[model samples]
Target chain A: QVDSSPGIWQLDCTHLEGKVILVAVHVASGYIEAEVIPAETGQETAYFLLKLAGRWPVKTVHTDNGSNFTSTTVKAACEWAGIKQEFGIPYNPQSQGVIESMNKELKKIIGQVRDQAEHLKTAVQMAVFIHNKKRKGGIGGYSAGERIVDIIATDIQ
Target chain B: SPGIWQLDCTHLEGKVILVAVHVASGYIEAEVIPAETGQETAYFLLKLAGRWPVKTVHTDNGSNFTSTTVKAACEWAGIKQEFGIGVIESMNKELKKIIGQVRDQAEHLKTAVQMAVFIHNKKRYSAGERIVDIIATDI
Candidate 1:
């Protein structure tokens, strides 16, 4: 469980409103975080990681072999933070399943609001908020928010 | 009791396609909509009513579904409105996949969506029967 060892995440990139989005999913609790970037570049990916590490401990990151993840800037960011980065094999569906599934769910949730909301970022945040609040049997009936809180509590103590 | 139906929307090539499924019969419907407003949704609801009477409409809590326009339409049609039905969600997922399979053919998008609905009804027929066929046979 992520409560026992927090911060293990899966990373993937998706597109929205003609912009690139770097998505990270906590493998244990299904908690999600994302950043909309101008493009998928090493520098942008590194910045998202740096910001994410500021709030929580980043133990390891798993991502595809995209140039954004293989770039020197991304490598340096992880090196400086003592974060382990693992790259999945090319064209492996299971390799990035977690983030891919979350992206699909995010898109579905976004569809519910894309017609109503004006700003793209607002829709993204709303989708993420809704997703985290949903309860699942795997999480012992705890919403992602509650599970994340439990994980954070474990980390601090 | 008449029967309950679920309604939802999905995007295809920049257009909105409203999808509806009869919960008891598993019969499906899909069509392109010019807009995603309450007015348009209400019209779609009435259109579905034309095919068969609707007792209740189960949908997500979006303004498109919960707007006064839709509520009034429901009241007029004697159809109750309910919220948060996930059945149409998986159907929407499959519709996306079907349309995706035909994405390369610039003009086959609508045809692809219709084909999906047709295939769903046929599958239900093979398993047991579609409500439409059952009604048709009865008539």
Candidate 2:
């Protein structure tokens, strides 16, 4: 629950080591506009949200019921930043289908080029860059980068 | 800097070599011995154990890996053995990618394949790590 502008943030967790850890971030339009750091320190996640709120005009955040997301730190951050947080259904792939699809697609493309490790990294980076630059049809076919920039500019103007 | 051998001949006529690779580290070693024999597999494992610290060994569920001798060898070495369907599939895909280039240069298919595997391993990523740095990490 944090509000800065009109856009919502999404967070997910993946297997790192043997345990699942959360990677929190927001994608405005189709671009990964910003990331929220892991909630290691008590106030770090909150501070991260505050910073994002001040700079980006984030209005809503969509999260799962993970402990990190539901932590008091995040709740306080949302309250202070005037943002709303929405939780998705647990164990349901369709609820977070967009991010899951993105993850699978990105992994498949990168995995194909993994024979050349350095080239694979470069290919994945290029793919992400291109994905961010492309027009997002769901968001009115404007690139996420473009939409974010336009929103900020509009507010300033 | 390891060798790759082809397992092309009939079980009765040719030797079956099991190539074991540590996925986390791209360190590979191969054992060439009689095919479909428990004693031969045991001997190969003994030789491999003498040179390297046997930890986790991956192989297909072939009779070679599942044989009583091979099973005993793994048990003696205290090595956990896993059978991966994906590794062989991916290896075949990689073989397809390089077979054309190698065939054009070499006269014999076996030599060309050996060269192709060598080049592929040299270039491929191991456990998401750089191939160049793998040797450095080992040393």
Query: Which candidate number would show the highest lDDT if scored against the true structure?
Result: 1
lDDT of each residue in B12-89, candidate 2, tens digit only = 114343444434444333333445566655555544442333556666666766777667766754666666434444
lDDT of 1: 0.69
- List the pairs of residues colliding in candidate 2: A1-A78, A2-A83, A3-A82, A3-A83, A4-A57, A4-A58, A5-A57, A5-A58, A5-A59
True contacts kept of each: 0.00, 0.00
Clashing pairs in 1: none
State which candidate has the highest TM-score.
1
Off by over 4 Å in 2: A1-5, A16-28, A33-48, A91-95, A108-128, A135-142, A151-157, B1-139
In terms of docking quality, how is candidate 1 classified?
incorrect
Residue A13 lDDT in model 1?
A: 90
How is the predicted docking of candidate 2 categorized under the CAPRI scheme?
Answer: incorrect
Native A-B contact fraction in model 2 = 0.00
Model 1, A59-103: lDDT tens per residue?
Answer: 888889999999997897687656899888632465477788888
RMSD in Å for model 1: 20.5
